[PDB]
């Protein structure tokens, strides 16, 4: 009753304004959930247009949400209780049964809707590679459910016109899935590296590009020719050889001098993407 309710928890809940129009729920593409009507009429050839995959003709009378949480039992002999170890959290299963489809008086066929709902089992060919079906979001008013996938659907037809269904009951079940990472796989690695939360191995968080290698060689040559007089004799006498080259490592950026023979001679410094840091005095 409203005399036994706990007002402490009730008053902590948000107050929702009544919509001025009767609302019908629908299923939309995920990532298209936050898209408005981009066009007045749906264009099938283009994507992310903000149009629902399936529009409910009547709202569900009730919706059932189920959530199992999986613990694992270990029965140690001669103990009062089992040992419960948390394994995983499980997925929410949404079920709406006894959904009404009725067009008997309008003399309009329900077959397009049944085909639309059935087509959710077919693999959506992406570039040319068959992929998993559309990932859905159940939207009703301002509420959404989750990234979900249609798992089971059933129709019970009781009325026909010319063999076309016109009155049916629909039972359907959705299952919440893991939220797909909108962040790109490469972006995720890059932002993992930026926060220095990945393993380091002495390499730069960015492998030098060929243009970066050219520019680093330029900077190293500039510094070496400016500071040639202060270099140790063992460095200036190898720089006097016109057969000596400067090589920069692609992953670590270490700058090295190679003599006429072509072997490593000395380490000059480090080069990251922008500045050249000469070795310590």
């Amino acid at each position: 009753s409203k005399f036994l309710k706990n007002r402490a928890v009730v008053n902590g809940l948000p107050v929702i304004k009544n919509p001025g129009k009767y609302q019908h729920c629908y299923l939309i593409e995920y990532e298209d959930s936050t898209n408005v009507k981009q066009t007045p009429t749906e264009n099938k050839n283009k994507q992310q247009q903000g149009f629902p995959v399936y529009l409910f003709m009547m709202n569900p009378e009730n919706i059932t949400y189920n959530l199992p949480i999986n613990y694992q039992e270990i029965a140690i002999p001669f103990t009062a209780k089992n040992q419960l170890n948390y394994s995983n959290g499980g997925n929410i299963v949404m079920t709406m049964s006894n959904l009404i489809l009725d067009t008997m008086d309008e003399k309009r066929s329900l077959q397009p809707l049944i085909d639309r709902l059935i087509a959710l089992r077919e693999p959506t060919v992406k570039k040319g590679l068959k992929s998993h079906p559309k990932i859905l979001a159940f939207k009703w008013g301002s509420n959404t459910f989750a990234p979900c996938v249609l798992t089971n659907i059933s129709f019970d037809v009781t009325r026909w016109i010319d063999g076309y269904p016109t009155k049916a009951r629909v039972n359907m079940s959705l299952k919440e899935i893991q939220k797909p990472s909108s962040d790109s796989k490469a972006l995720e690695e890059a932002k993992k590296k930026v926060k220095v939360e990945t393993v380091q191995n002495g390499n730069l968080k960015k492998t030098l590009s060929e243009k970066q290698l050219i520019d680093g060689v330029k900077r190293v040559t500039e510094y070496l020719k400016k500071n040639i007089s202060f270099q140790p004799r063992t460095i200036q006498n190898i720089l006097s050889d016109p057969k000596s080259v400067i090589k920069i490592d692609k992953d670590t950026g270490q700058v090295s001098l190679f003599n006429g023979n072509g072997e490593f001679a000395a380490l000059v410094g480090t080069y990251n993407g922008d500045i050249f840091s000469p070795s310590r005095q």
């Binding site: 050839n45 283009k46 994507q47 060919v125 570039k127 040319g128």
Partner: protein
């Protein structure tokens, strides 16, 4: 704009070149209103997925066809007899399933 067509039909902002290559036009040159452009469909396209060999003597490397790479075994165990060459040409039989004296 080509950016809008790429975003709508192909879903990728940088896919506009695919549209431009399909029409042979300069994107920087003005397209007249009511002009017919050809937009490729995503369903029927050659996937632009980079092919690698994850286990190579250099660790990782790009390949474009995988037939002019080190993965081609068209010459492994080659017996220069005419017979084997003809069967390489028709079906690509590399190894012989038998060698029995019998």
């Amino acid at each position: 704009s080509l950016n809008k067509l790429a975003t709508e039909y192909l879903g990728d902002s940088f896919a506009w070149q695919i549209i431009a290559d399909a029409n042979g036009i300069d994107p920087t040159k003005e397209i007249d209103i009511g002009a017919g452009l050809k937009v490729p469909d995503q369903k029927a396209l050659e996937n632009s997925i980079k092919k690698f060999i994850v286990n190579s003597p250099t660790g990782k490397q790009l390949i474009s066809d995988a037939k002019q790479s080190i993965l081609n075994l068209i010459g492994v165990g080659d017996s220069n007899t005419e017979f084997s060459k003809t069967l390489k040409d028709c079906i690509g039989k590399v190894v012989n399933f038998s060698f029995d004296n019998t």
